[model samples]
Target: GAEGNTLISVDYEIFGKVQGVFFRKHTQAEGKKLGLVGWVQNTDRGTVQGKLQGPISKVREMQKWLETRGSPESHIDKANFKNEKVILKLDYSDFQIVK
Candidate 1:
């Protein structure tokens, strides 16, 4: 049942006002705070894309953060998350900003 299913990780893309507002840096900090391992980066299409890995519960909380929070000046227009995957081993050792 859905009650027994939980996601282990997610890939997210954020759009709008994300570039100039230090969104990647803040995402790095928040990911660490949530005890997740991942990397956030800017896309050539003017969006922010990233991956997050950790416990299902914390990752879900982080998803909520994406909907409502970010660098103060950033105006988040939309957040798209998918690829709910189970990682046998988290690829990232720590959260960080990638170029």
Candidate 2:
């Protein structure tokens, strides 16, 4: 477990025309670039959503980055976060497209 580290998983909802605008793809690339692994998808009738989990710093960076580039026309309405144990449960190793 290499000295178990806790990664932060942030769940966010952005308002506006967030669907079908390449938001998920943009976020996936940003997450991967920041070395975070997770998934992003646009809710059928809601907003763009995603969860990022990885190194503390990387996750933090991704979180900050998402606030800006993740949604271009969309404005972040609300966000929730929780610390996850990545020592054993490494469910996400790469950002993915969730359609």
Indicate which candidate wins on TM-score. 1
lDDT of 1: 0.76
lDDT by residue for model 1 (36-91), tens: 98788777787878777887878878887877677777777778777788856677
lDDT of candidate 2 at residue 93, scale 0 to 100: 69
Q: Model 2, range 34-80, lDDT digits (tens) per residue?
A: 67777777777766666777777677667667654455645565544
What are the candidates' C-alpha RMSDs? 3.6, 3.7
User: lDDT per prediction?
Assistant: 0.76, 0.64
Query: In angstroms, how far off is 78's CA in candidate 1?
Result: 1.7
TM-score of each: 0.82, 0.69
